[PDB]
Amino acid sequence: AKIFSGVIPALMTPGREDRTPDFDALVRKGKALIADGMSAVVYCGSMGDWPLLTDAQRMEGVERLVKAGVPVIVGTGAVNTALAAAHAAHAQKVGAQGLMVIPRVLSRGPSIVAQKAHFKAILAAAPDLPSVIYNSPYYGFATRADLFFALRAEHPNLVGFKEFGGNADMRYAAEHITSRDDGVSLMIGVDTAVFHGFVNCGATGAITGIGNVLPKEVIHLCNLSRAAAAGDVDARQRAQELEQALAVLSSFDEGPDLVLYFKHMMVLKGDKEYTLHFNETDALTESQRGYVEAQFKLFNTWYAEWSKLPGAVEKYKA
Q1: Where, by residue number, is the active site (predicted)?
Q2: Binding site members
Q3: Which of 22, 157, 225, 247 can pair with 198 through a Cys bridge, CB separation 3.0 to 4.6 Å?
């Protein structure tokens, strides 16, 4: 699966001061991220504040990205199945390249029968678009090997598995699902598991949140991890070293305030458009702000010295 190889940021959505999405800025960051070495982008996902945005806003945002010539994977996350399917239908119509299928929420979540039918509806709405199933305990439901291949036998555009639930569930997917010579691939679904996914689970690519902030640094880690997955000794040590230093900033992808945390980093880096949220009350506390700026300063300081190192460090930049 080509659209699912390499490093793939999940774009956040820039609001204006009247807090309606800024699609021009979205297009700008999409272009820039690709220009930095990314393969594609995911929109509109949790990073993109989709529950805070209308389906029409998300569709316009996607169409703008696709028109701009950015490879796009469309997030099908929605309040119900019909609208989830709608995002999938629009995806294929505008000519989007990929489709992330998100489990059913709010109603009948932990019901596998309901999730199966929900999955089929989404996949059938875009039979020509390569698709990847998102799996997270946040949905109170776990897609196992039996369900995945029941779906795939009926929908050949299902060719990817994205895991969030932890190191153990990632191994399971690697063991029972994504390791056949079949085209099916494992994608990294959380920033803190880059090394694990690539070297221990045979992942094909990574969806990154911190990547929006530190693209060259995240790409650097993915290059080393893939090298380590190829048996490179020097890379295996360095990747663990870089993953360790990035762990704290990456760990924000795990918590609830991930959009708040990552939008503030973009502000530090110099992007004014990620200052205001779509809900004004949404803001880090003074403490939370103090914590990121300290850790953001720390990693940049550490990486400034470390990235100069000879060997795999030097060889495996972007």
Answers
A1: 134 (proton donor/acceptor), 162 (schiff-base intermediate with substrate)
A2: 207
A3: 225
